[PDB]
Amino acid sequence: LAPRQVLDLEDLVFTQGSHFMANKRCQLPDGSFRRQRKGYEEVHVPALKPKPFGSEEQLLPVEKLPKYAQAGFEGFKTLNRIQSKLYRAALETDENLLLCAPTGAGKTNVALMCMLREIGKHINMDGTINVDDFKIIYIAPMRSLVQEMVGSFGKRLATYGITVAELTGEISATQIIVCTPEKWDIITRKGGERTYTQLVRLIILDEIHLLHDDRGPVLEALVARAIRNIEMTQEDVRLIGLSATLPNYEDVATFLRVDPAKGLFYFDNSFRPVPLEQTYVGITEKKAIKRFQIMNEIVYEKIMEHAGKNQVLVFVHSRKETGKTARAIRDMCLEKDTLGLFLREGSASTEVLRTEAEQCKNLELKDLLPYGFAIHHAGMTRVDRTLVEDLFADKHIQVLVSTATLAWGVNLPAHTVIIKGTQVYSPEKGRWTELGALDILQMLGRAGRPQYDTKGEGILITSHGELQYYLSLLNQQLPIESQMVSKLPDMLNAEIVLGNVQNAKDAVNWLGYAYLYIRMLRSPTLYGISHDDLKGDPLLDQRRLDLVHTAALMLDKNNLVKYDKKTGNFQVTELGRIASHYYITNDTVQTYNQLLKPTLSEIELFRVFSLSSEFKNITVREEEKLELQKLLERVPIPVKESIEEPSAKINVLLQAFISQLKLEGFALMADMVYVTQSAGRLMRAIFEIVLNRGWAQLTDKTLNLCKMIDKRMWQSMCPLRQFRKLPEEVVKKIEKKNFPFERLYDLNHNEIGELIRMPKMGKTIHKYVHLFPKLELSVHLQPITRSTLKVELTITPDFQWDEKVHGSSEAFWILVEDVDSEVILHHEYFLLKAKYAQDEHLITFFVPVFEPLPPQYFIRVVSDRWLSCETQLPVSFRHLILPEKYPPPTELLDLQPLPVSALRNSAFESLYQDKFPFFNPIQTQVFNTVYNSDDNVFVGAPTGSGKTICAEFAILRMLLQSSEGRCVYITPMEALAEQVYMDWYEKFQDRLNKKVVLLTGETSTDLKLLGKGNIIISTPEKWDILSRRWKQRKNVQNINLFVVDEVHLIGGENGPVLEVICSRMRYISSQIERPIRIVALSSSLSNAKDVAHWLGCSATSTFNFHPNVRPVPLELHIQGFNISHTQTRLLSMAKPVYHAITKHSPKKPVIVFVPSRKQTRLTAIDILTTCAADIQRQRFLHCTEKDLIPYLEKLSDSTLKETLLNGVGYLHEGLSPMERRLVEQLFSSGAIQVVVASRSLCWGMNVAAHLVIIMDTQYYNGKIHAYVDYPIYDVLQMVGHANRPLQDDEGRCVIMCQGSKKDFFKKFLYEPLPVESHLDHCMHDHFNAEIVTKTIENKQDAVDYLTWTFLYRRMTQNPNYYNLQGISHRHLSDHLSELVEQTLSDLEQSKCISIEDEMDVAPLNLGMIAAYYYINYTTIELFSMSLNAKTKVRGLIEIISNAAEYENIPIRHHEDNLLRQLAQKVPHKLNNPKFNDPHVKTNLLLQAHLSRMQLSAELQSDTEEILSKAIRLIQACVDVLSSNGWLSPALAAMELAQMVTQAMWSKDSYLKQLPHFTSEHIKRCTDESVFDIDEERNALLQLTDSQIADVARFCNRYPNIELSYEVVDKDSIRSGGPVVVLVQLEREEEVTGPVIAPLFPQKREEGWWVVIGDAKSNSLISIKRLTLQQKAKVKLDFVAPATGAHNYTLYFMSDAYMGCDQEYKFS
């Protein structure tokens, strides 16, 4: 709050723009002599004599500069004067440079030396260059020069393998981007700018004197932005300015962070390569054709001074004026006795035969070409332009007239250059004005030829009055100033939208970086600042604050910004966002805001477009009036009663452009080009505004108008026109025929050529008809709540793709509109990529509905580009059954906050009293019911309400009742399980001294834990594979207490297992008539009742609380971003995250959740760098660094150290548990204020914050090549993490999401959450399971089974969700019967079960196998299919890799390249792999694990999850193979189990199992067996005594095994009878501990196969699996063959070790 004054901006601004001279006088060099011809004044400035060399300064041949840089300098034998003075600065230092040189001094090669300096760091030895490690930006003022430079740099740098490209009218694949100031500004406004600019190490500003021009502010804004980004990102980016020699250049050096003593170089006019004789003509008085004829006379007089060979280049201001000036000279040169006729003295045909042979060509070229004359212009002569260029370059063409576009576009200097008149038509000023300084400079800069001329000459013809300006300009006296005040509001708004200025103060500091600042300082009077004011305020705080204040008020008026004078804060609006993004001035935005409405007609639309302030200076001149009227008659859209006003003129010009009408009047043509260049940007703007306001009619109109301005055709015309290669009269013929385009789809090419009376085209048209983008639409709708529906939209492309026509992709808009098509209820952008063309695309979202339900909605999918490309699908509500309105939440009573003493135990109270005096309202409200009663209870409540100690109440009561009591607690997540295990081990096993156990993967030890445990922690799957056998396991049958936490996760992925085990627990509870107490905890449910009845809770025992009763009040803020491209959106979220921290939780803890591992580190670093660039560093660090060093010494991660030092940690799955616990501990202690964790870790974090920020809502799924939404469950959890009852009076959450999703989060966060069962899609594994254990003996048993499920309750509540067509009991029974019938059918077809008498069922072999190992039935079905007698190890790996277990193995972003790399690196080459295939991935990763290839952290975690189920899969393969009686594939499967456990291959050293052995040790051992293994032992090779403890611990575990065997009654056996081989296994070591497999993640147990088989016929006769311990008896019984003589083989194989395998043959 500082005193602010409103300025009048128009007063401070420079009106004349580039034409403005701060120049007072002008001092002419040497000969100034004036010659007065009485019709005009002639002022001559002579050439400067060539300067003698300075001290020791000498030219430096290319061989001298470093070796790797010589490429691109071929064709250059010698370095330029300038470039030798600059070579050290450019190549050998990183300093910011300002190079001022005469125009044409070849400042280019200097820039190239800077470029080569940057390129030179990336060499990489045997690699040529690193292309993707950097980017270089070249900003040129003109598009022509952009193309020029792209060419030159492309050629010169081609040897380095570098791409140079043009951005202004694959971006990611280009190293050098050449482009215009406004183009780059456009790019870096987008906010996802950094995706482009993150890699930029170098920026080169060409012709930076452009600062003086009206376009100058854009340069200012650019440099300001980039410099501020250098501070903010800490990444150093080199700036190279290249400028003309003009006053104030040092101020430019200051602007560019150039050291005046180091990188600042100024060369006066004496350094011009060709010394220049200058002639300045100006015209005395004002009369008309007399004036113009004077001008043409001048031109004549001046040409003739060159008669024989000299080349003259004439510059004229119009594409017409080339002809007219060559006309006026040919009229006055050849009219009086043919003056100077035959400029070419080759009238005997020297070069005449070359130019007479080239005459064949069009326009005025053919006329002038036989003489020395030619023309080059912007009137589009195409190829003829290039030939004119070539012919002038070879010095054939003598006199060439052209437009400035030549001076900028290609390099062709002449000996003498004449510029005629210096008057040009400016469309935006709407007037005729004095030509831009840059144009004059570049043009006169073409005078004299570097190798062909000792002296150049140039002549500038102009009007006399007030044009002393040009003498100032070309003689280095015209000062460079700042125009920033003109454009300040748009610039400021741009900076506000990017988030770089959040208020007035920030804005003032931003102004500090502008060229305007330096200029205002050093020339205060010019900018209207009193020396007194400047004295009292040297840093110009007052002026900057005032300017900012004024611009702010202007933006606030026009509603681009909400701005309050008090705080001085800025709030971005949508209009401002769009305004910055589409580059439209703010008055325009206000106008659109005023006139835009849903019912706006098309006429009105065109008029609105006409009032755009970009056009405010356009007027209708008299001489064009007539033509306008003609145009008006030919354009289709009525221009309403606006007569010819500027408005109407603009309107009609745009229409005329879409109609492709030809124009004559040249000012009218200019105006047209100007309105049509703008038209697309402005219209795309309007489209965005109305699209996001949801206005359907106007969205449709505007989008269409965009496509029409783009494709230059009306909707009325034929879509085929959009193909440019098609003959226009063919199309006009088609249009003349009256009939729909659609019909062409159903016609053969014959009928096509037939209907059009032009059969020749009949085929080609057909082709194009089927090249036209076309989509099919399928919809599946499921209701969610009475207000909300879920839509699955399937998009199927129907058409042929053509890279030429469709490019790499095609964009569409999905529009969900209401019944009247007046409102867009939901919209989103859909991008169909060419590589993934032909895959069907599933797009899921929710849409709102209102209980007076309409008949239907509509889904349109419209092309973003193509005219008349659309598909509309009605979505019918006629049969829709909305689910039942859900009941009110349980009212929260305000009880006296019941004290810890209310628990009656002192030992119990000691667990609590230290932490809190009293229980919270929820905990006291439930306290009686859960602690005092034994009945089942459901508690709903927002995460962080402390639902945990209600469960604990239940547990304390269970222990109160019976000391030996047993309780099972299930959590959906293993992470949560482990946290609960720590917490409750301490709370129960330590203090109360009970037993607390945690269930693991393996069955036996888990059974044990079930036996000893008072408190059992488990995930649903573990408890499932346990309690499936509950009939046979008593410990499952008796448990006093069953607690399920997070039961709403029933509605999520893996929810079905939860549902199954809970329902099984209720079934058991009712079957043993000793009730199993059931405590269910959940987030607030919209429907608690269904879950209650399901689990047996009374309405009174049911506490379901609204999310607003949450103990710590939640302040939720949701921030929409309209961006479709995820990466871009992510990048534009970066700064708003920081602002969120500094607004809502400046001093308090902050958690930030991000989508991926990489984004944790990245966002951490963003927060860091931004923080330190606020001149607040360690502001997030609340201790001293010193204190932290002892902990940080324990860290491996460099970046994590560095960020933690600044008070920001991060958490991802790559970090060690030690590191994670460290970062968590620091964050809890308050040492670091900010932690950034990945979304995966939201369940595995014990920690809490004052502020939780959710950065985006989506993650990438590589399998489907698309982004998918966060489960609402994960988001509920994340929001839960901002809860601090002790420290905070409020929790605070800021969710950042794509705009389309915004409303969603406002709903199901504030309101309670509806859940459904997905069990009906999981039925098979569970039904098979209950058939094996005979809980289901028949179809009726399955129907009965289904009545215990949550599914059963939900089906009548929300029928349409489960695809029930009614809620009647008939519909329920019918649907359930259909479901069990289908499920059982599938299970029979998969050979898992047998069906008998249509009612009864029985378990089969494959079914039993699947149920036993807990494997999906399709996996073992697939096994049964793909296994045979000849199957081997490689095939086995392929087969287990295809398991359904590995389907959910993730494919991450850009992992296809890394997997593609892996594919060629592995022993077994894979056949036609798709690298988004998870099974291909798990295959390669399995080969990687076998070969001991170490990989990135992601691939390692993946390998862990694979190896988890690898064992059970292989054992299943054993069972299946043995049941078919195959020997060779078996035992190979066993060997595969072994070599998977010990991570080794088939043929390999058996010694690799011993720790610390490498491929070097093995080499000296053979010169092999673990059995062959003190002095002689350790003296074999290199040894340390810790490896000795480990190896000795290995050999005392590693199996020592002897086997005895007898075939009972050898002789008493003959054909057909039973044969019993009794085997005896004994080991001479006492077993202590598990298997040792360092590379195998989990802790396994030895297991062994005793096998009997005939090795000849390849038959497996008998098999048995067991576990040894000390000694074991093994009975193998099998049936006997005939003729009493048979030879068998007895195998003994492990599942763990190689080499322990034994063989005994017998008979």
Ligand SMILES: Cc1cc2c(cc1N1CC3=CN(Cc4ccccc4)C(=O)CC3=NC1=O)O[C@@H](c1ncccc1F)CC2
């Ligand atoms: C992409 C999208 C667009 C829109 C949405 C929601 C989405 N979703 C859906 C979605 C579903 N589920 C499953 C689920 C399970 C239990 C309870 C609720 C949902 C998630 O877990 C996460 C998820 N994320 C989304 O973003 O709402 C629309 C909308 N907004 C307000 C009112 C009505 C309405 F339809 C606005 C358009």
